[PDB]
Ligand SMILES: CCOC(=O)C[C@H]1CO1
Ligand SMILES: CCOC(=O)C[C@H]1CO1
Ligand SMILES: CCOC(=O)C[C@H]1CO1
């Protein structure tokens with residue numbers, strides 16, 4: 002069983018790769034930095050069980066993995082872009098293009114590249130990591146929220162056609178997941194350290210804590226196991242009960 | 252840990268008990284048939300890893316399990332009631348009351364009975380098994396669809412208050428799960444044999460099969476493992492892609 | 501064209517009755533207080549254009565209206581119950597029964613009582629006023645939120661069967677609508693007066709204001725006009741953008 | 751007040767312009783055909799209460815209307831693109847880019863161009879006409895369904911930030927609205943004549959007819975009247991009950 006996890010150093014990246022690996026999958030990993038064989042090797046050394054790739058774009062990643070490791074059973078399209086809090090009139094239209102390109106076109110591209118071998122083998126699983134920002138409660142986050150909703154709708158739409166061919170498709174829409182060293186999107190500093198921040202997580206999520214990489218990885222692994230294919234189409238809000246807003250005063 | 256699965260013979264019951272058990276939970280099982288000794292012992296003999304309980308009403312069941320076993324960590328409120336397709340004006344009000352009694356009042360009563368215990372220890376898991384009928388595509392299913400939505404909304408709402416106390420709350424909202432010889436809600440006959448049933452499922456569900464007990468058990472067990480408490484509040488659409496509608500002709 | 505509006509003194513009651521009336525409907529009104537012909541008459545005197553009823557329960561209301569005024573074209577099931585912020589283990593099961601009875605069984609009962617004449621005339625409109633508390637962000641509001649979600653699901657389910665017979669069914673799920681004198685659910689005091697309260701509406705809704713009776717009445721009247729029957733099934737969140745939660749700190 | 755309705759000849763266009771106008775708004779109308787003088791004047795002559803504009807691209811259109819008419823109060827982004835049913839692997843990436851360009855980038859561009867003006871005066875209305883396809887029951891509609899969801903999510907999101915400035919934002923998400931001789935998306939032939947089309951609509955929609963231009967115009971006009979700004983953020987499912995699925999056989 003062969004898996005690919007994209008952007009392996011951020012967001013849901015590590016939780017996913019590490020848990021799948023433990024589950025017995027051969028896990029190919031992609032990251033922008035794996036461009037420099039510098040960075041690639043310091044990661045092969047640190048994680049002998051994962052197997053990182055240099056390839057960057059969807060089709061060369063899929064061919065590279067198919068060639069080296071057999072055939073992709075599992076795609077985890079762990080998608081990232083920076084989050085800027087501009088209001089609408091202050092963005093460039095091109096900014097939305099780049100945002101959509103990053104969060105919406107990318108997973109289309111990955112799924113479009115993997116789909117026909119999965120369909121031929123009548124087997125595979127496809128998971129997008131999106132965001133609870135879709136139809137969420139934030140302001141001045143317009144580009145990000147819509148692009149992410151794009152990607153979750155893609156996942157649901159795709160399930161509908163691939164179910165014929167035994168291929169479940171899922172979206173995982175997180176908020177407040179511990180990214181650790183990565184800035185995408187809840188790095189320890191300042192999210193564990195800054196008092197103001199620990200107060201914010203405390204006020205607005207219901208479990209009054211950040212989620213964990215391990216939690217995110219366990220779900221990915223559960224979905225990837227073939228244990229619950231009937232859930233196909235589901236958007237999972239991976240968010241600890243966010244949002245919670247206080248009772249009336251007085 | 253200790254789980255209670257209600258109406259174990261039906262709907263999501265067997266998948267939940269079998270699979271919980273398989274996962275080393277201690278599983279007490281409620282059923283309307285366990286009110287008779289003979290029905291109970293037969294079950295205990297067929298499924299010696301489960302412990303079937305005789306108690307029927309909510310408060311009585313929870314104390315009984317707390318006695319025999321010390322604490323209830325995992326409540327699976329596996330709620331059932333007969334679906335009949337009638338138009339709104341052919342019902343009587345009390346038919347709706349009854350449906351709300353079985354589908355909505357009942358999970359509230361179990362949750363209510365177990366909560367303090369759970370909150371005291373700042374640990375536990377609560378799972379309601381509702382139905383994909385909630386905001387669903389059916390007609391003349393008005394009492395059932397709405398009662399199920401109330402139960403699902405109740406899960407979501409409880410998850411908000413009970414986060415404070417480290418208590419995950421979920422709803423599993425199924426359609427087309429294989430129910431063995433149970434008429435709730437997709438018994439293998441006619442659903443596995445009769446051609447017009449076989450084709451209806453091929454037509455309206457994405458994966459083009461029924462769901463299995465094992466898939467739903469696997470879900471419950473997962474939610475109750477503590478491996479992913481952070482999904483708290485989730486309403487799970489266990490419906491194999493349902494519904495799909497054909498393109499334009 | 502004949503309309504009935506329930507609990508006419510609270511929640512969406514007045515906005516609805518007054519606007520329908522202006523729209524040219526004969527508006528029968530129900531309120532618990534119309535029990536005492538004391539209260540009934542001081543309301544017929546104050547609103548000569550509305551026509552209040554003494555009848556309390558669904559079937560005697562519908563028969564009474566059908567008999568006096570012709571035939572019910574429009575039902576507005578403006579439903580109310582008190583809101584208590586207990587946690588779950590502190591409620592009596594009977595409390596949920598009373599809550600469900602009030603917010604869920606009542607509109608079932610009203611629609612069940614009106615449905616077959618509307619179906620015979622192949623004409624009518626049915627609107628439940630529910631709440632944005634359904635699947636909403638509050639805590640310790642469990643009974644209320646679920647009962648209200650019950651009632652919105654009813655509305656959506658009912659649309660599906662009555663569309664055959666030319667009958668649109670809608671739910672209107674409000675938050676922060678000015679109730680005025682009524683305590684159900686945003687009376688002027690303290691919602692306009694209390695500083696702490698004006699701050700809360702300001703922080704959590706996006707229009708940073710309470711909604712108005714006039715707004716609520718205009719929507720009801722729009723839905724009741726026969727201008728947009730194709731919307732049938734819709735739950736309208738009548739809530740001014742609630743909830744909004746602040747950006748991260750720092 | 752002054753409204754702009756884009757792609758006026760198609761989809762939600764005519765209902766929106768006609769009905770806005772009927773409501774005393776001043777209505778500037780965009781279309782891809784108005785790039786030709788002859789196509790434009792013909793329209794102006796058929797519909798002398800509308801003012802058709804020649805400008806095509808987002809920034810150019812908004813300044814042109816602001817010139818001729820002084821301010822834009824109401825933006826109706828009536829967005830269109832051809833639906834073709836292909837499986838995911840039969841598309842090329844750039845087909846998805848193009849669909850996102852027309853359905854998602856485009857309303858963003860119009861909203862972006864008009865916003866400051868609107869925010870300055872702390873008044874205005876923004877309406878996106880998307881589609882009920884978003885979380886919909888279709889297959890092989892993957893690019894269209896997802897592009898439309900992004901646009902709907904964009905409406906919701908904008909409504910949050912633009913409340914601050916008294917700006918209501920909505921999405922109208924239709925299915926089965928009569929489009930006259932427009933192929934976007936339910937032209938009267940074959941949808942009013944051909945039996946298999948007539949029956950598909952009778953089968954899957956609750957009200958068992960098409961929606962009318964007038965119903966959608968009525969909606970837009972209402973949203974833009976300021977009579978109910980408090981619905982801001984709403985995604986409107988203008989789909990006549992769709993979808994309904996048959997009971998068990
Ligand atoms: C920026 C607000 O936070 C989120 O949207 C969650 C994160 C996963 O995308
Ligand atoms: C056709 C109606 O049946 C269902 O909703 C499935 C079962 C869970 O309720
Ligand atoms: C008590 C919290 O406020 C609401 O749920 C809105 C009101 C209409 O029911």
Ligand SMILES: CCOC(=O)C[C@H]1CO1
Nearest residue numbers: 881882883924925926935
């Ligand atoms: C069958 C797909 O067509 C639609 O979604 C209706 C139109 C608005 O997009």
Ligand SMILES: [Cl-]
Nearest residue numbers: 175176177178
């Ligand atoms: Cl996150």
Ligand SMILES: [Cl-]
Nearest residue numbers: 425426427428
């Ligand atoms: Cl089922």
Ligand SMILES: [Cl-]
Nearest residue numbers: 674675676677
């Ligand atoms: Cl309210």
Ligand SMILES: [Cl-]
Nearest residue numbers: 924925926927
């Ligand atoms: Cl349409």
